[PDB]
Amino acid sequence: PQFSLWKRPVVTAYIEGQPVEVLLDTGADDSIVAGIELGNNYSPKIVGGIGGFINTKEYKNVEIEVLNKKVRATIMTGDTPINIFGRNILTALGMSLNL
Amino acid sequence: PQFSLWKRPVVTAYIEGQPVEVLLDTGADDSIVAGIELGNNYSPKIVGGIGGFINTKEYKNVEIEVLNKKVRATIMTGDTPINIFGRNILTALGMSLNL
């Protein structure tokens, strides 16, 4: 695939079987989704962004299906106005920022 | 150029001659830079990210040179923890996320 950036880079991912729309984000260190329930084996984490900081719930080894690929990656759950797949997953997929 | 997301993709841009480090961010609609003063000709706008909303000053037709490309575009200024070049800029440079 190729994402030209005219529209937001939005794709549907499957996190442990459940679909979600995610924004692929090159300026994100972590990936963070809201509105799914991933259980109780998480570690608490504090994540910062443009507006400030948020408590998040971190899960390691999550099974991710996106862009036909199937990764196991760390997913955080927290309050986000948009779900994001940050470099941790982008990297796993083999993505590149090109010019 | 290729930016393999194993490192934050930070680059140096010159905003009207002044150099600045910016993260190329696909997860950003707009470009926000802290620390430069661009004048009296602005429209106040509020932007949002994780953690919250931040007020900005919107400047139009700002001259930019980044990656041996010279472009003119919108730039906001605000108290951003890091300078962002968003989709409005990456689009103008003909950058893309490919897999």
Partner: peptide, 6 residues
């Protein structure tokens, strides 16, 4: 909307 996310 801008997602920095450090």
């Amino acid at each position: 909307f801008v997602f920095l996310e450090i």
